[PDB]
Amino acid sequence: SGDDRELAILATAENLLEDRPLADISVDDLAKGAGISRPTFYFYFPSKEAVLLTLLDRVVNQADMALQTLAENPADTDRENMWRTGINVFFETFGSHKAVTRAGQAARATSVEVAELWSTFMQKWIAYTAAVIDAERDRGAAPRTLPAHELATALNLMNERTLFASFAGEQPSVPEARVLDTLVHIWVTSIYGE
Amino acid sequence: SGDDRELAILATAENLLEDRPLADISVDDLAKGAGISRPTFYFYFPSKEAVLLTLLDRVVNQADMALQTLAENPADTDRENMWRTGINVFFETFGSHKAVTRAGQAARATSVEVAELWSTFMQKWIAYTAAVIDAERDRGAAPRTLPAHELATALNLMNERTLFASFAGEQPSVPEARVLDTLVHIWVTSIYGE
Ligand SMILES: CC1CCN(C(=O)Nc2ccc(Cl)cc2)CC1
Ligand SMILES: CC1CCN(C(=O)Nc2ccc(Cl)cc2)CC1
Numbered sequence: 298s299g300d301d302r303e304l305a306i307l308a309t310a311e312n313l314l315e316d317r318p319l320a321d322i323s324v325d326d327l328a329k330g331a332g333i334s335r336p337t338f339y340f341y342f343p344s345k346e347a348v349l350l351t352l353l354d355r356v357v358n359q360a361d362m363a364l365q366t367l368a369e370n371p372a373d374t375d376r377e378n379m380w381r382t383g384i385n386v387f388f389e390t391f392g393s394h395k396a397v398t399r400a401g402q403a404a405r406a407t408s409v410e411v412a413e414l415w416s417t418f419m420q421k422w423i424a425y426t427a428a429v430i431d432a433e434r435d436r437g438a439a440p441r442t443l444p445a446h447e448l449a450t451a452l453n454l455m456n457e458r459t460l461f462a463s464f465a466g467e468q469p470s471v472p473e474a475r476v477l478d479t480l481v482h483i484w485v486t487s488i489y490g491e
Numbered sequence: 492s493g494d495d496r497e498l499a500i501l502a503t504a505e506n507l508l509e510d511r512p513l514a515d516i517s518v519d520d521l522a523k524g525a526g527i528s529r530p531t532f533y534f535y536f537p538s539k540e541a542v543l544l545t546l547l548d549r550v551v552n553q554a555d556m557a558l559q560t561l562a563e564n565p566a567d568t569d570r571e572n573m574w575r576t577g578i579n580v581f582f583e584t585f586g587s588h589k590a591v592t593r594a595g596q597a598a599r600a601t602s603v604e605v606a607e608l609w610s611t612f613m614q615k616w617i618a619y620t621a622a623v624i625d626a627e628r629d630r631g632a633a634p635r636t637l638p639a640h641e642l643a644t645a646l647n648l649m650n651e652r653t654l655f656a657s658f659a660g661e662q663p664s665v666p667e668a669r670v671l672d673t674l675v676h677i678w679v680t681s682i683y684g685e
Contacts, residue, residue: 447673458649
């Protein structure tokens with residue numbers, strides 16, 4: 298029931314974020330959807346902003362955990378497929394949570410905690426990217442061109458901006474149904490190209 | 492004097508944005524710096540947000556006009572230098588106006604007019620990028636890989652996110668003194684790589 302009311306608040310928030318921004322969702326809306334009173338809501342979360350932080354934390358950790366699984370279970374693959382399957386973890390995980398994704402990205406501007414969470418995970422994903430590039434260079438598959446960590450940083454920042462623009466249908470954006478091929482091409486050419 | 496007071500308001504705003512966000516700059520601060528009264532300020536601009544819109548408009552048009560000049564005067568160049576000199580227009584123009592750059596990007600979230608301005612110019616820069624890629628393909632220098640406009644979109648979005656992260660000293664970011672080489676490498680490998 299503690300778990301239960303908390304989970305219901307989170308599910309309600311994710312559902313309501315599909316139709317309007319967090320600014321237009323009230324605590325009364327969250328409490329009503331979750332089948333609790335307003336003061337009961339405040340037992341579980343201090344604010345609607347804290348609800349969004351918890352949602353984003355769950356989605357970012359879901360992506361991270363999926364990437365860790367993939368890292369433990371090398372799909373038998375060419376180099377291009379290796380990177381495609383990895384980028385796809387983010388494409389599918391965040392694409393399955395577009396409202397939380399969008400609201401989380403917006404909250405980076407106003408929430409130190411959201412900004413630090415995103416920063417922390419991006420640093421982790423960049424470091425892993427650089428470690429893979431380093432291993433591809435050590436095995437003779439990739440040439441020693443740019444500093445690996447700098448290349449990794451620009452490619453991860455490209456994926457952040459490009460994927461989220463595509464999900465939002467921003468003008469300009471890559472169509473969602475083209476974003477994987479687009480990013481994979483740029484990663485493979487920049488990592489393996491002389 | 493109309494031009495003059497308006498220019499002074501703009502110069503004051505750009506100076507104050509170097510030390511604090513627009514939210515922490517008052518109309519009294521702008522009027523004081525510009526040597527006018529508060530009601531005189533409102534003759535020239537309806538809000539501090541309108542001042543920022545005008546500043547951003549001037550900086551984006553400065554970049555655009557520089558790119559047009561470059562487009563008219565082909566530096567004699569290899570393909571890599573062609574793209575480096577082009578990316579550099581943005582690196583130098585926006586790097587020379589970091590406070591307006593930063594504040595303008597933040598305002599995209601809250602100002603339809605700022606969002607539309609940025610969108611309009613990004614569409615223009617993407618279309619030009621795609622036209623150059625198309626010409627490189629027509630002359631036999633670049634292979635016919637991704638749809639040119641989709642490639643152009645992802646590369647321009649990479650440059651937006653990467654350049655602005657670098658200017659802000661965001662964690663993560665590419666160091667400013669490495670961002671040109673980083674982006675050039677990714678553009679040249681992705682445009683010319685099979
Ligand atoms: C080994 C790497 C596989 C590819 N990868 C990514 O696609 N990064 C990524 C994707 C989406 C966002 Cl929003 C941010 C970063 C990093 C880890
Ligand atoms: C022919 C092309 C030269 C390279 N170029 C860019 O660097 N785009 C760019 C740079 C910075 C930002 Cl913030 C946004 C876009 C586009 C036009």
